[PDB]
Each structure stands twice: as structure tokens, then as C-alpha cells.
Design an enzyme around this catalytic site. Sequence first.
Site, PDB file in Angstrom:
ATOM      1  N   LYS A 123      36.737 -13.088  71.981  1.00  0.00           N
ATOM      2  CA  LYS A 123      36.358 -12.001  72.882  1.00  0.00           C
ATOM      3  C   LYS A 123      37.046 -12.120  74.237  1.00  0.00           C
ATOM      4  CE  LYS A 123      32.057 -11.732  74.479  1.00  0.00           C
ATOM      5  NZ  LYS A 123      30.666 -11.314  74.780  1.00  0.00           N
ATOM      6  N   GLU A 172      25.043 -13.752  84.069  1.00  0.00           N
ATOM      7  CA  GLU A 172      26.111 -14.716  83.811  1.00  0.00           C
ATOM      8  C   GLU A 172      25.591 -16.163  83.716  1.00  0.00           C
ATOM      9  OE1 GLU A 172      29.865 -14.246  83.654  1.00  0.00           O
ATOM     10  OE2 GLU A 172      28.939 -15.900  82.555  1.00  0.00           O
ATOM     11  N   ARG A 173      25.881 -16.883  82.626  1.00  0.00           N
ATOM     12  CA  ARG A 173      25.563 -18.318  82.535  1.00  0.00           C
ATOM     13  C   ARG A 173      26.545 -19.034  83.453  1.00  0.00           C
ATOM     14  NH1 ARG A 173      25.934 -16.537  77.235  1.00  0.00           N
ATOM     15  NH2 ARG A 173      23.956 -16.183  76.320  1.00  0.00           N
TER      16      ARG A 173
HETATM   17  N1  LIG Z   1      44.891 -14.174  70.209  1.00  0.00           N
HETATM   18  C1  LIG Z   1      44.563 -15.378  69.684  1.00  0.00           C
HETATM   19  N2  LIG Z   1      45.483 -16.129  69.040  1.00  0.00           N
HETATM   20  C2  LIG Z   1      45.178 -17.325  68.504  1.00  0.00           C
HETATM   21  N3  LIG Z   1      43.947 -17.866  68.566  1.00  0.00           N
HETATM   22  C3  LIG Z   1      42.925 -17.220  69.181  1.00  0.00           C
HETATM   23  C4  LIG Z   1      43.184 -15.905  69.788  1.00  0.00           C
HETATM   24  N4  LIG Z   1      42.025 -15.489  70.324  1.00  0.00           N
HETATM   25  C5  LIG Z   1      41.104 -16.452  70.082  1.00  0.00           C
HETATM   26  N5  LIG Z   1      41.635 -17.481  69.400  1.00  0.00           N
HETATM   27  C6  LIG Z   1      40.896 -18.695  68.987  1.00  0.00           C
HETATM   28  O1  LIG Z   1      39.493 -18.413  68.984  1.00  0.00           O
HETATM   29  C7  LIG Z   1      38.788 -19.330  69.823  1.00  0.00           C
HETATM   30  C8  LIG Z   1      37.654 -18.631  70.565  1.00  0.00           C
HETATM   31  O2  LIG Z   1      38.194 -17.788  71.578  1.00  0.00           O
HETATM   32  P1  LIG Z   1      37.329 -17.343  72.862  1.00  0.00           P
HETATM   33  O3  LIG Z   1      37.885 -16.036  73.363  1.00  0.00           O
HETATM   34  O4  LIG Z   1      37.266 -18.533  73.790  1.00  0.00           O
HETATM   35  O5  LIG Z   1      35.841 -17.041  72.310  1.00  0.00           O
HETATM   36  P2  LIG Z   1      34.549 -17.288  73.246  1.00  0.00           P
HETATM   37  O6  LIG Z   1      34.980 -16.811  74.605  1.00  0.00           O
HETATM   38  O7  LIG Z   1      33.442 -16.444  72.669  1.00  0.00           O
HETATM   39  O8  LIG Z   1      34.323 -18.778  73.159  1.00  0.00           O
HETATM   40  C9  LIG Z   1      39.820 -19.907  70.776  1.00  0.00           C
HETATM   41  O9  LIG Z   1      39.564 -21.286  71.048  1.00  0.00           O
HETATM   42  C10 LIG Z   1      41.139 -19.750  70.052  1.00  0.00           C
HETATM   43  O10 LIG Z   1      41.493 -20.989  69.433  1.00  0.00           O
END
Ligand SMILES: Nc1ncnc2c1ncn2[C@@H]1O[C@H](COP(=O)(O)OP(=O)(O)O)[C@@H](O)[C@H]1O
Lengths: 68, 456, 109, 177
Positions: free
Chosen positions: B153, B179-180
Site C-alpha cells: 500500500k 496515526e500509529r
Molecule cells: N512495487 C513493488 N515491487 C516489489 N516489491 C514490493 C512492491 N511493493 C511492495 N513490495 C513488497 O511488499 C512489502 C510490503 O510493502 P509495504 O508497502 O511496506 O506494505 P505495508 O506498508 O502495509 O507494510 C514490501 O516489504 C516489499 O518487499
Amino acid sequence: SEISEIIKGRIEKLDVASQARNEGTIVSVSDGIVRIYGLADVMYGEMIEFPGGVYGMALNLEQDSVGA
Amino acid sequence: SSGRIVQIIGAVIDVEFPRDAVPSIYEALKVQGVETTLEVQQQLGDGVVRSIAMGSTEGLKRGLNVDSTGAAISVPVGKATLGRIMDVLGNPIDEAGPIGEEERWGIHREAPSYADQAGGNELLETGIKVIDLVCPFAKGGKVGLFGGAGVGKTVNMMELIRNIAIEHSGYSVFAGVGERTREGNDFYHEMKDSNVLDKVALVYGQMNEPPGNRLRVALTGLTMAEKFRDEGRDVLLFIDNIYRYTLAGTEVSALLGRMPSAVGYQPTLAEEMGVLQERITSTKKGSITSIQAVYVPADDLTDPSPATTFAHLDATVVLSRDIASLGIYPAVDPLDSTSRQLDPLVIGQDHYDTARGVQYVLQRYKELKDIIAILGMDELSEADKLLVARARKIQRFLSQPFFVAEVFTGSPGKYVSLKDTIAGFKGILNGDYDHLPEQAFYMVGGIEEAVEKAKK
Amino acid sequence: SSGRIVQIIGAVIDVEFPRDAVPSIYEALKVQGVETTLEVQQQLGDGVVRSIAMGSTEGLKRGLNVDSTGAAISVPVGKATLGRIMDVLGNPIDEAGPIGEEERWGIHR
Amino acid sequence: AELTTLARPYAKAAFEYAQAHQQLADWSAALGVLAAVSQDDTVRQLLKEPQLTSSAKAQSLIDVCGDKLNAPAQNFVRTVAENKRLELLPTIAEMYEQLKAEQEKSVEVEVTSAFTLSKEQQDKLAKALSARLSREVRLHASEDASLIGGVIIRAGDLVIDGSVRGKLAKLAEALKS
Ligand SMILES: Nc1ncnc2c1ncn2[C@@H]1O[C@H](COP(=O)(O)OP(=O)(O)O)[C@@H](O)[C@H]1O
């Protein structure tokens, strides 16, 4: 004002207690709640000392009473 | 003239004023000698106003002098808010000095009028292929965002911030409602390390704050987005949860002693939703487009909080765990995401035919995947096997490398225009690229990059 | 000093006392001339206490004099209670005469 | 509830007693002295003390007022204090005065003006208002530099605006629209 002089002289000899701002009197006790007249300098969350070593905490600072 | 505190019950403070100087509804008040701000909710009569404190009331007493500011809560606006973290009062909560603003705006204003609506159904290009094909965004539109955690996200939000800043010359405002603190510090350091911090203004209203702060923090971020819209730009506004805005309205209405409505909510639920959502529009100067993540209580879509929220949304983006387990990023479900702009009067016949053809081929592949799972690949006909090959090519062409994910993929990012997305998916749907392998269609930009990928 | 009944709404009875002689919380009170006991629940202010009857409220009127016992409801304890049926006040509700206890205890502890 | 809602039957009982026993000016002076005594800060601090009974508060008010109260006014003070209604004592007096103004067929009229008006001008406005309202009127004149001319008549909820500030606001509303 429209207060006469003799009525004002009767007013000045009235027995009126001087309520200190850090002092109060218990009006009502029910179910762990003590409602107190006075205590005009108490803060929200301040500890209140009762006789016998009992302590309380003020939570409802209303217009004419304090719930502790 | 100043007033005096006559009552403190929790976060609800009553202040008495002289009778010719009663302050207005939603006026900001300041307690003398303390860093406490109050917002007037009601006028009770005899000079007494009933207000909500925008902080902790521990240590306040009756008898304290209260000054009136003459106006509503006024936040800094302009270019100086970019890169900075702020609270609901606009004070900085990073340790980086004062905001050097040139203008302060109050956070309460009306919606733009009927004659100020821009007209049309103009699309906002995001540069992401699955978003610009399957669930297209409108300028002035609203996007519900669904899914849990760990499916990408935040990476989608940083890629939307980078794309609207670099390719469209606009800005972004984040408003974190509830916000946490751990995740806000993490999101701030992730936006420093992805070089997108200076493109977005951050406003947090944290979870350990009293609920008027969590009620007014989206109005603060929307006021900064309105100043960015009134400089002639196209602005993105991100709302972290709209259900926490609704619940902060429930808590503030319960503190004022209002009689509650059905399923526990505030009786002004639709009105408090409409005051926030009708300010997010396309006007004659510029537009604000909002991306708002939605929690659904008890998995009930007919609950009053999502039923009031879904009346304002123009598109939904659903994030899926099963697409992310296949390695396809971004993990947008092409069958569960919807849009009101996916309509041949809005986007034309050609875009609609390409998107409904992709959705039919993926739905037929979804049922044939259960057929292959129940009886094997030998049950399918030659036309079913041809559709499975085209559908895997469509499913891999929905993936795309991002500029903010170059640590993850190990590739340069790509921005794809809408013309190249319709031409590429039409080229897969007409059978023009059946001679390519499916692994050439994974993590490229246009269809020509898949053509040069299949020579290596 | 004695108080007077000012209000009877159901099982809940309000009694007004003079301001130097307000009974404490969980003090037993005896209504004069009727065989009923009241237990103080709340102090409402202005000398008024709110109480619950330990018997039926059919023979009660406003204006009845109420005495304070100065203690809580005390019941008999010891091995004199063995083989007997008692009510909430510790009176015997069999017909085997009086309980010859040597000690009484208050019920609140 | 409002103060007038609570203060209505006390003023109606005092007006019906004072009309039945021909003591209208005696009760009007008594309720004026009682209202002014109950609004003084020392008496107001004494009347909010929690350890005093209602009989001692009525006895302190009767001992303060003294010779300005006859015996049914003292009975009225004990009836007001037994029902815990002593803070109503200004409002009761005001409503009594309204009842006496309906009995003697008179109305208390406030007139505000831009410059000072003479006795001929007050007698002229009082005769026009006595012809309109069918009551004996009592004018109370006052000054205001906000008006540039004319008078403003206020009689209860009736407002007659003859000032040129109101005609300026009418011309501004007529040319703005
Ligand atoms: N565009 C992308 N390309 C490759 N891996 C991704 C991408 N978006 C997310 N990921 C993987 O998904 C995981 C979760 O993403 P994140 O946006 O941090 O979710 P949240 O914010 O809910 O924890 C990341 O650690 C990453 O490894």
C-alpha cells in the site's frame, strides 16, 4: 444603589465564613463518589486529602461542586 | 475581552465570557500561561460557551483566563509545508525549526459552489497500467483503497506522490487520521529514503490524542491541499483511514451528550461526511483527487459507516495477497476493483472494449484454473488452452516496475501513458504477440519493451 | 437525634435527619412503632439519607420517626446458630424460641 | 427550564394576594428590596453555604430586610426558601411588575434618540404611543451617537424604527439586491 444604609449595616454584621480556595466541605457521598462544595483552586487530576488518611482524585470540576 | 473557565469535565471545557463578547462557533481559544487550545462547539447562553480541548486537560483549574483569537484554527499553507510533519494546529512536530510560511488559512470553509464546478469527466493519468486500464481515476474523484498490510500500500502511495510531482507538476498532502506513532516514523523514514519527502506535506493526528484532534486533522490537510489547488495545480490528498474520522465524530458527539443514532453512530454522520467530501472536487482553477483507505466494521458492507462512505467514492482499488504471492507488483485485483469512470460515455468505446475484454479473459481464466485444478490440463480444448496462454500474458503484463521500488526489483522504474496501455493490451487481446514467451511480459513498460525483452 | 421519613418510592425510603446527627453508610435504622429496619445506602446532602427497607412497606407513612442504632446490621454468631433457621436480620424464623448467642457481628467487612 | 417558567407561580400568587388585600405598592417595595438584597455578593455567598438549613437562610433574609417586609411577605420568603427557590428572587420581582403594569393599564417604553429630546417632544411621542397602545405610557429617554437622526421606540417586543440609520440600511438592501 437602592440598598439603604441601615440594611447595609445589617449586612456588614452577618456571620459569613471566609472560604479559602484550597479548602472544601463534603456535600454528598454515594458509591465511591464524593461531591464537594468549594475547592476553588483544584486541578483536574489533583489528589484531595480527606480525614483519616483517605485520599481522592478530582474528576468532575462543575460550576458549584467537585466530584471526586 | 477574555473569559474564565467555569467547568472541566474531561476534554469538555465551558468558558464564561462577557455578554457583548461571546466568541463564534468554531473559534479557537487560548488558555493563559499554558500551551492549551480550545475549539468552540456550542453556545449555551448567558455568555458560556462549551468547547473541546485540542490536548490534555491535566493540571487545568477553574478560574483560568482564556483569550479569544477572533477566528478559527489557522494553519500554515504554501510551499513551506512540503517536507514537514505537522499536527492539527499546524505546529511542527519534527525537530526542524519553525515553518517559514507566508500565509495562514482557517480550516473551516464551505464547499465550492454549483457555478464553480469544472465540468466534464476528465481522467487523471497515474502512469500505472492496471490503474489506468481497469479502474481509472477522475480529476476531483475519490478512491477507496482496500486490503490488509504487507501487500504494497505504502509503495503505491509513494509512487503516486512521485508521479503526480514529476510528470504533472502537482503536490501531495498526507493526513493521518488516527496515526500509529511507530508507523508514522517508519513512513517518514521510508519517504526520506525514496526521495519523495519534499513532494508531500505531512499532517498527523495521532492515536493517543483526544478525538477533536483526530476529527479536525483531515480538515487541516484539506486546507493545505486547497491552497495547492488555488495555485493552479492538480493535488493528491491521502486519508489514512476514513473510518477513524467517522469514529472520532462518534466520540466527539458522545462527549457533547447528543442522542445517538442507529448502530451507535452520531446523528450528524452523513453531514460530517459531506462537509469533508464535498470540498474534494474539480474546480475552474485546479483539482484535488483523494485516495482514502477504508476499514469495514465486522465485514459488513451495510453498516452505516461504509454505507455513508461508499456514496462518495468514485473508484475502488482492492489489494490482494494471492497476486503478491505470484510476484506481481502492484497487487491490484483486476476483477474486484471497480470504477464509475469505466463507462463508454466517459472514456470512449475503445478503452472500454479493451478493459472489458481483459476482464472477461481473466474471469474465464479464473474458472478454467479451477477446471485444471479439478481434472488436469488434458480436459481443456484448443481454444481453452489458447485463452490460458493469452491470459497468463495479460496477467504478467499488468505488473510494472516502480521508481520508488528500485531497491526491490533491481530495475529502472517506468511511467506508462494511457495510449500505450490500451495499445499494448489490445495487441495481446488480438493475438498479435502469441509468438513471444510469457516471461518477456513480466516487469516491463510498454509492449515494445516486452518485444525487446524476448530477444534476450 | 431522630429523623423523619420524607419519601417512599417502592423499596427505597428517604429519611431527613438533623445536620449534626446524620447516620453513616450501612447504618441500621429502626422505624418507631412498626417492625421494620432500614439500611443506609447513600448520603444525599442536606441531612437526607437514602435507604432500603428490610421488610414490607405497606404499614409505612411519611412523617414516621426513625431512630439510628449507631452500627451496622449485627447478626448472631457462634455455635448457637447451629440447628436454627434465621432471616437476614438474625431473628429466628423457626418456632424454637430465642437464639442464646454470646456474640454478634456486623455483616459488612 | 427558564427562570421565568419557574418564577411565574410565585409572582402570580404574590400578585393575587396583593390585589385581593390592596397592598400592591407594599409588595412591590418588598420584592424590590428582596431582589436587591439577594443580588449582593455577601448575601449570595451566605445563601450558597451547604451547612445552613433553608429556615436559617429565610431567617437571615428576614433579619436583613427588617421593616421593609410585613408578615405575609415573611410567609412568602419562608415558602420560597422551603422549596429551594431563593435564586429566583430577582425574576419573581420582575414578573410581579409586569402583572401590575397590566392591572393599572400602563406600559414601560424605552426611547433612544440621536440628540436630546425636550419635554414637548416626549409628551408628543407619549401621546402618539398612548393612542396606539391604548395604555398610559411611561417613556425612558436615552442617547446614542450611532443614530444620525430620529428615534427608536421599544415597547416590549414592539420596535418602531424611525431613525435614518434604518432607512440607510433599507436603501443599502434596496440597492444591493
Ligand atoms: N512495487 C513493488 N515491487 C516489489 N516489491 C514490493 C512492491 N511493493 C511492495 N513490495 C513488497 O511488499 C512489502 C510490503 O510493502 P509495504 O508497502 O511496506 O506494505 P505495508 O506498508 O502495509 O507494510 C514490501 O516489504 C516489499 O518487499
